[PDB]
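README, section 4: Worked example with a bound small molecule

Sections 1 through 3 covered apo chains. Here we extend the same pipeline to holo records, where the ligand is supplied as SMILES alongside the sequence. The molecule in this example is magnesium ion. Nothing else about the input changes; the structure line simply encodes the ligand pose together with the chain.
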Amino acid sequence: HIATVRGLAVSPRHPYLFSCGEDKMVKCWDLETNKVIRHYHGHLSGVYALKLHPTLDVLVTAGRDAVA
RNA sequence: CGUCAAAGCACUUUGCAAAAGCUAACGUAUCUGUUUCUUGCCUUUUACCAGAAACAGCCGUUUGUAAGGUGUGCUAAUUUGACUGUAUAGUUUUUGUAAUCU
Ligand SMILES: [Mg+2]
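The generated complex, written as structure tokens:
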């Protein structure tokens, strides 16, 4: 991460660990290899929260751009 | 080669689907890109250097199947599959040592 990390979430159905930070990018860490595999890009500013949907394969992030 | 069965057959165009299960060339051939690391050259970025891991793309290949095209046929041609496939009265089976009664 380039800047402060502001949100983590360990998926209970995948061996993943999603993280977000004030550096505007959301990362998907593969916990089987401890390496970043996915990048989620659209965010105009820092990201302050990260949550994972309990059932679907979808995640929600909300940040300073007044948009979730 | 033979008998039986069903399928028109040979070449070809396109669509659809699939392609390691028991460690192994779908391709005896061989490119590119992204991410995360470690490097090289480095004044800063692109373009770069060369090794790894995880992913993708492109050039191709094979098979199945569906609908067509061309040339020849259905007054036959070819293909695919299956088959416990052959003679023979002269001792080892199928051209009778049978009848007779008990
Ligand atoms: Mg500048």
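What to look for in the output: Residues 30, 33, 35-39 of chain A lie near RNA strand B (CB under 10 Å from a C1'). Residues 17 and 26 of chain A are 11 Å apart (CA to CA).

Section 5 describes how to batch many such records.
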